[PDB]
């Protein structure tokens, strides 16, 4: 009984590739497209909510997740791997940061922490790598708005804009054409919706698209009043209704 | 063939080859015979030397004043199992002031041997044992195989060519079962039985080992000039 697999399941092949990381990336390749774009006063992350059946309620399946009040995540690859990573990412933001400094981690550091968890699954005994790539968008007082990509290897890179999964190659080309360093948040949302329509085959509407922003503080979403310095979460999930509003003016 | 890498693997017909290979080491071991009446139980063991310059490997181990065994196969494994038995006999005495039932001794060995057949990394015991004892329900003889199977008998033998002794005892049954209150006659029948398994060698004085336990007899071993009487 117990884990007698104390040895690595990811190892260097003679050519120097790490097979299981490569294959995990291949699983990310098959995953449904998701993307992120960084505006001057915000970040937008978006993805398709491709359903398992029309009997399934796809509202109950959240592909875009709040990690901290100013950080959100989206992914491409294996959903259940993503789900446990979000759980761990939320906890680690508390255990190794908030419980120490009394404030939430800045984007780059929480990303660093997630990357560490993913790296360890690439070397520790008796596990496979995580089969996802994450896009993490956030804001913090001293670094402003940022957007990171985290891969199965544990590598992460900051992006102005990018996509991952199925139709990433086309989407990245599309984003290069439309991105500039003067985009206002609403412009980026509109570019995101345009990019995503290329990769979406079937229905394209507020119920088939999941989309969130890191933007202004939302005092209406705080839950209480009377502490001036607490102004509310910068993360906001756009409603099914809010997405459709922007689809008429597409 | 493909399924004999370790004890944790069943063959497609439901066999455990590592256990069967353990059973095979017993078969290569030197013959030892067990038999009992209603008053005594006797072990006779044919010992095996390495050459003309060496001692004859002892085959009989005392476990308590009222119990002991003989061995065929890997001697170190018999040492481990006999040691475990000594501890269980001892525990029973110290805690309960009660001599260990030969039947419970058998159950305890079965369960100890079984554990080595169901887990990764271990190996089965490579030894067979014949346990004799006199307890609160009389004289007893047990046969232990490292598969975990333990059987109560009037008489038996294990080891190389034990089959000869086993048929003789099967024929002699109704005679020896009733050698009650005569030590030397039960030993004689054991010596006669072990002879059915000899080839190109006869019982010498540093070749033969006998143990007796019974009603008014502590488990005791005879060796050397003390067995000359019986050759």
């Amino acid at each position: 009984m117990t884990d007698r697999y104390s040895f690595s399941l990811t190892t260097f092949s003679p050519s120097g590739k790490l097979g299981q990381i490569d294959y995990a990336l291949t699983a990310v390749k098959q995953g449904v497209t998701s993307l992120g774009i960084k505006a001057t006063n915000g970040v937008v992350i978006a993805t398709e909510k491709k359903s398992s059946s029309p009997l399934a309620m796809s509202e109950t399946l959240s592909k875009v997740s709040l990690l901290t009040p100013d950080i959100g995540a989206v992914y491409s690859g294996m959903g259940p791997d993503y789900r446990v990573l979000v759980d761990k990412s939320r906890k680690v933001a508390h255990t190794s940061y908030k419980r120490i400094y009394g404030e939430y981690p800045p984007t780059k550091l929480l990303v660093s922490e997630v990357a560490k968890i993913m790296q360890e699954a690439t070397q520790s005994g008796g596990v496979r790598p995580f089969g996802v790539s994450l896009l993490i968008a956030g804001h913090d007082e001293f670094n402003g708005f940022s957007l990171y990509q985290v891969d199965p290897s544990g590598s992460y890179f900051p992006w102005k804009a990018t996509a991952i999964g199925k139709g990433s190659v086309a989407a990245k080309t599309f984003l290069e054409k439309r991105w500039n360093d003067e985009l206002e948040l609403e412009d980026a949302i509109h570019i995101a919706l345009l990019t995503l329509k290329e990769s979406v085959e079937g229905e394209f509407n507020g119920d088939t698209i999941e989309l969130a922003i890191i933007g202004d503080e939302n005092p209406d979403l705080l839950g209480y009043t009377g502490i001036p310095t607490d102004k509310g979460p910068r993360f906001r999930k756009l409603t099914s209704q809010e997405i459709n509003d922007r689809l008429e003016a597409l | 063939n493909n399924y004999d890498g370790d004890t944790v693997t069943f063959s497609p017909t439901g066999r455990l080859f590592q256990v069967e290979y353990a059973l095979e080491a017993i078969k290569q071991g030197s013959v030892t015979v067990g038999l009992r009446s209603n008053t005594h139980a006797v072990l006779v063991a044919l010992k095996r030397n390495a050459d003309e310059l060496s001692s004859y490997q002892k085959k009989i181990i005392k476990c308590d004043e009222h119990m002991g065994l003989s061995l065929a196969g890997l001697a170190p494994d018999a040492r481990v199992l006999s040691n475990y038995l000594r501890q269980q006999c001892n525990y029973s005495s110290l805690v309960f002031n009660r001599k260990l039932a030969v039947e419970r001794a058998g159950h305890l060995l079965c369960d100890k041997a079984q554990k080595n057949t169901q887990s990764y990394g271990g190996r089965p015991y490579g030894v067979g044992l014949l346990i004799i004892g006199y307890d609160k329900s009389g004289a007893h003889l047990l046969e232990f195989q490292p598969s975990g199977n333990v059987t109560e008998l009037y008489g038996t033998a294990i080891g190389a060519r034990s089959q000869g002794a086993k048929t003789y005892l099967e024929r002699t049954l109704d005679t020896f079962i009733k050698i009650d209150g005569n030590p030397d006659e039960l030993i004689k029948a054991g010596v006669e039985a072990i002879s059915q398994s000899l080839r190109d060698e006869s019982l010498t004085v540093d070749n033969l080992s006998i143990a007796i336990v019974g009603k008014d007899t502590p488990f005791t071993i005879y060796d050397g000039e003390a067995v000359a009487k019986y050759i």
Binding site: - | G5, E24, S54
Partner: protein, 235 residues
Amino acid sequence: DRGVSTFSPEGRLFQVEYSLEAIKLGSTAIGIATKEGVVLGVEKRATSPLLESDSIEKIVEIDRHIGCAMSGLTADARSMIEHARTAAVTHNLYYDEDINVESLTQSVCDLALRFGELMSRPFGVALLIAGHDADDGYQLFHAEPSGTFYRYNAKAIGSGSEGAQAELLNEWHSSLTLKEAELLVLKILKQVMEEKLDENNAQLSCITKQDGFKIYDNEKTAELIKELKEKEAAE
């Protein structure tokens, strides 16, 4: 591969049988038991003329009444010796007496099958344990990595052993003197040795009740070597 503790289909432990192959590659060691003492002798077998031969230590004291010769992977024996010494000294601490040779040997042999997936493999060395106690007198034991030990009147182990043992079969009788046994070990070593026997490439020792266990100086052995050459040219 396959488990380190696996049985072969003939009912033998693979790893144990393979260690026996390594012991066959070992330098020769011979012991002879007599009523005046037990003699232990070994082929030192230096791999080059530059290596200083007195540093080769294949005969070893365990207690004053117990000594030991080895053959095979000799580095594996260090911890066996260490256990043996601790067992003997500990026994004396608990019981205010000398520890029996057989009990010592049993204690060492308990180590041997403690391997698998405890240590990673069996020992690749065999030992001739020789000593004296008041109960059973002068004794010689051969302790294998199988955990089995045999008492012997005489015994050879190592590469020259099968030849040496047939030689020992003829020569050993129950009334050998100590001097006879010393010469006999020397004679049989010279036969099976590759290089030519002398006081530098072989070593002698004995254990007597009176003086305990002693390794012989190169001077003392050199004289027994001369003495042996003289006895054998003389018939």
